[PDB]
Write a structure and sequence with these properties.
Chains A, B: Belongs to the transient receptor (TC 1.A.4) family. LTrpC subfamily. TRPM4 sub-subfamily. Chains A, B: It comes from Homo sapiens. Chains A, B: Homotetramer. Chains A, B: This is Transient receptor potential cation channel subfamily M member 4. It is classed as membrane protein. This is part of a larger assembly, with two copies of chain A (87 residues). The relative contact order of chain A is 0.16. The termini of chain A are far apart. Helices cover 45% and strands 9% of the residues of chain A. Chain A contains two helices and three strands, in the order H-E-E-E-H. With 87 residues, chain A is mostly helical. In chain A, strands 1-2-3 form a three-stranded antiparallel sheet, with no helix packed on it.
């Protein structure tokens, strides 16, 4: 719900980039590690990340999909691309 | 003692997978880093992990074996398999 252009760019480029180097902020992405709260009037369920620049609260509709995307991204980036560069 | 199917799957696949990328939650596996407590009526000794999805409390019967398995897993996965893929 931050929806701020610098914040959006941060979460879109900087954080995924840092994940390539072992900086994985599970608390800011996984709903199982956050506190459920009714932050937003919009329908649905929401959770409150503790991170400063992680958004005030994030939707938890399909969070297993976010975790799956994190798994695939870690695989590809950390292992496949880096080893391909080494080769 | 969570013994919940999503939680079991999490601890069986997601956490070991993330350990490949430097996310090693020693506090949730090593009993030396946890607080001893009599959570469960079942006989034995138990400790209380601080993790949210680490189980309410874990047995500490042979925890040196858990640490040894962690050592072997780190070795194999992080070093041997990744370097084999590079080769």
């Amino acid at each position: 719900r931050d929806s701020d252009f610098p914040s959006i760019l941060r979460r879109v480029f900087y954080r995924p980039y840092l994940q390539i180097f072992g900086q994985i902020p599970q608390e800011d992405m996984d709903v199982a590690l956050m506190e459920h709260s009714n932050c937003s009037s919009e329908p649905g369920f929401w959770a409150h990340p503790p991170g400063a620049q992680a958004g005030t609260c994030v939707s938890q509709y399909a969070n297993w999909l976010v975790v799956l995307l994190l798994v695939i991204f870690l695989l590809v980036a950390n292992i496949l691309l880096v080893n391909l560069l080494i080769a």
